[PDB]
Structures are given as structure tokens and as C-alpha cells.
């Protein structure tokens, strides 16, 4: 499956793509403002994620740090990034179908649109100014708007037991972005696409 990753932000982002235990394609790359990077994701990929990282520094070997979404200091991500990270999430070729969503469960850093480039389903978007509107207690000093589980580490926010409900903090993400997951047990906003669809992830889709 192809995923065209486009940076429409006025700032550079370092795109990342991983399934948690391995990179997807090269795993990461710098995207200056306006740049497009097309990756190939193996059919059958389950639990894949794409995200942006901001304010990165990498040396010649691809080692360094990002202020948001850092994946163990690597340019080429092999693991998930450090919150806050707006997430484009996907599972492909799952009994003949693809499943996509945007999630704020690990916070928000950069606005994003995640849409198919092929027929048969709609895209999902979280493009509101969540960083600007972020509640004081969730603001990440390193940049971004943290989720409440990251900040407070309680069973209720982290949905440790599976009993959790919505919270004042999850409702903030849900109000700004109704089409993204705001907590672990949120009412799903996952879209079913034909199996083997192709996609485009656009950072800062509106500006």
C-alpha cells in the first residue's frame, strides 16, 4: 500500500512510520514545508502508525532528538514516538478490509488529515488548533498538548482496567476534534476502507 505523506505546515516536520516493533518503509524522514514523501507499507500491516515530529536535530548517523514524537533518538523510527503525537493509525488487509483512524489518545502535536487516495471510503481529520487551546495542565513544555494518561498516570485516564469513562480532559480533545479518538474507550471513529486501499497523510491540512 502506498502512503503519500505531505507536509503542508509552514515549519519542517520529521515524518515517522512504525508498527511498534519495526519501521514501516525507512521509518522516518525530514519533510520541509510543502514536501511529499511516499512510503510503501506491506499488505497485512496491523497496528501501523504515522506521525509528525517537531524541532528535531539529527547528526550524520541519524541520531539525535525531537521535542515531540521522538522515537528513541532516531531519524528512522523503529518504535512509537514519545507523546504528544497526533496519530494516523491503520490496520490493512484485516479480513479483506482496511481500517483507519486518527487518535489523540497519545496527545496532539501537529494537525493532520488521513484520507484514502483510492475509492470506497471517506478520510478522517483532526485539524483544530489543539496546541493553542490546550488546557494549562496538559500543555507540554517541550511542545504540544499531552493526553491526560501521559500527564497523570491514573487508571481512569489510561483505562488500565477497561472500565474508564470520558473525562474533562478527553472531552477537550473530543470537542476540538470529534473525528479522532479522545480516550481508549471512546465511541470509535474508525473508517472501513476496501482492502489494499492507498492513502495520503497531510500535516497541517488547512494552513
Residue numbers in the entry: 1 to 207
Paper quotes:
Therefore, we set out to perform similar experiments using conventional single crystals mounted with standard cryoloops for three protein targets (EP, Thau and 3CLpro). Cryo2RT was also applied to Thau and 3CLpro cryoloop crystals, yielding high-quality data sets after the cooling/thawing process. In this study, we systematically observed a slightly lower resolution for crystals collected at RT compared with cryo temperature, even though the same dose of a few hundred kilograys was used.
In contrast, cryo-crystallography has effectively addressed such issues, leading to the seminal success of synchrotron structural biology. In this study, we introduce a pragmatic high-throughput RT data-collection method, Cryo2RT, that takes advantage of the well established workflow for synchrotron cryo-crystallography. The procedure involves crystal cooling in liquid nitrogen (LN2) at the laboratory, shipping to the synchrotron under cryogenic conditions, as is commonly practiced, and thawing the crystals on the goniometer immediately before X-ray data collection. Here, we used endothiapepsin (EP) soaked with four different fragments, thaumatin (Thau) and SARS-CoV-2 3CLpro (3CLpro) as test systems to show that RT structures can be obtained after the cooling/thawing process. Our Cryo2RT method applies to conventional single-crystal data collection and achieves a comparable throughput to cryo-crystallography, enabling high-throughput fragment-based screening at RT: a highly sought-after method in structure-based drug discovery.
